[PDB]
Ligand binder design. Structure first.
Ligand SMILES: *[B]([O])([O])[C]([C]C1=[C]C(C([O])=O)=[C][C]=[C]1)[N]C(=O)[C]([N])C1=[C][C]=[C][C]=[C]1
Ligand SMILES: [Ca+2]
Length: 263
């Protein structure tokens, strides 16, 4: 069962492109191990967590309500909108939109939530304002990461993402209720079964968020640990290859197995 760094390097040998990885201790924030920690990768759908962090920050500031209902029309729908496409008559609450963006990777939900904050540049401003001067969102879904490769637009680094996720889940950046709501949505993720979850032993906690481009890229962010409580953050990104989705998934699952077996 290869050591995690050995397995990450092997994944990159087999896939082509780059694989980036970091593991942080959740309590201390210390980097436990990493590979390409400071290199840029496309965020893909992993940004949806950060988006909902910004929404929750607005809640905490008295500027938004999770119960506020948003109506939208057929013309607002984009690709990969399995939840929002079923609510054209009734609309969805802000909190429902975050649940759908996080748990189902719903793209229209994410775009609606981006409208609530004024667009991708405002999410960047939110990240900047929490001390992340690396991560940037510039585009909407689904063009995010599909229109001509890393111009630094729509990218993060493993360390920036892991650091920022730790601050959202543990900091007093968010209120206790909002921190808990964010991790609850990640825990309820429905679409990342083939990834880290496939390696997870019974009894363990995981809160995660996956992402994909059609070709070349995959990723996941997670807070996980034994005995029902998260104790570490893991971020894995891969980009730049011509590997199949099955291949990409397999390699993330095998990195997961290594990190669990060598915990
Ligand atoms: B997202 O990664 O930006 C988004 C939706 C999506 C999420 C996931 C996941 O694992 O959470 C898997 C697949 C799609 N990506 C896209 O909209 C992207 N254009 C896309 C579209 C089709 C297939 C793969 C990627
Ligand atoms: Ca290499």
């Amino acid at each position: 069962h290869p050591e995690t760094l050995v397995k990450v390097k092997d994944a990159e040998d087999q896939l082509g492109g780059r694989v980036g990885y970091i593991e942080l201790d959740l309590a201390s924030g210390k980097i436990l191990e990493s590979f390409r920690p400071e290199e840029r990768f496309p965020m893909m759908s992993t940004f949806k967590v950060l988006l909902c962090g910004a929404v929750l920050s607005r809640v905490d500031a008295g500027q938004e309500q999770l119960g506020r209902r948003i109506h939208y029309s057929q013309n607002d729908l984009v690709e990969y909108s399995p939840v929002t496409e079923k609510h054209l008559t009734d609309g969805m609450t802000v909190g429902e939109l975050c649940s759908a963006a996080i748990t189902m990777s719903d793209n229209t939900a994410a775009n609606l939530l981006l409208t609530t904050i004024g667009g991708p540049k405002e999410l960047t401003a939110f990240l900047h304002n929490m001390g992340d001067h690396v991560t940037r969102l510039d585009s909407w879904e689904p063009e995010l990461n599909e229109a001509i490769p890393n111009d630094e637009r729509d990218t993060t680094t493993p360390v920036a993402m892991a650091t920022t996720l730790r601050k959202l889940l543990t900091g007093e950046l968010l209120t206790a209720a909002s921190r808990q709501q964010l991790i609850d949505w990640m825990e309820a993720d429905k679409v990342a079964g083939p990834l880290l979850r496939s390696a997870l032993p019974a009894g363990w906690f995981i809160a995660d968020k996956s992402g994909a481009s059609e070709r070349g890229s995959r990723g996941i962010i997670a807070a996980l640990g034994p005995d029902g409580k998260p104790s570490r953050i893991v971020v894995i990104y891969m980009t730049g290859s011509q590997a199949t989705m099955d291949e990409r998934n397999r390699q993330i699952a095998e990195i997961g197995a290594s990190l669990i077996k060598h915990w």
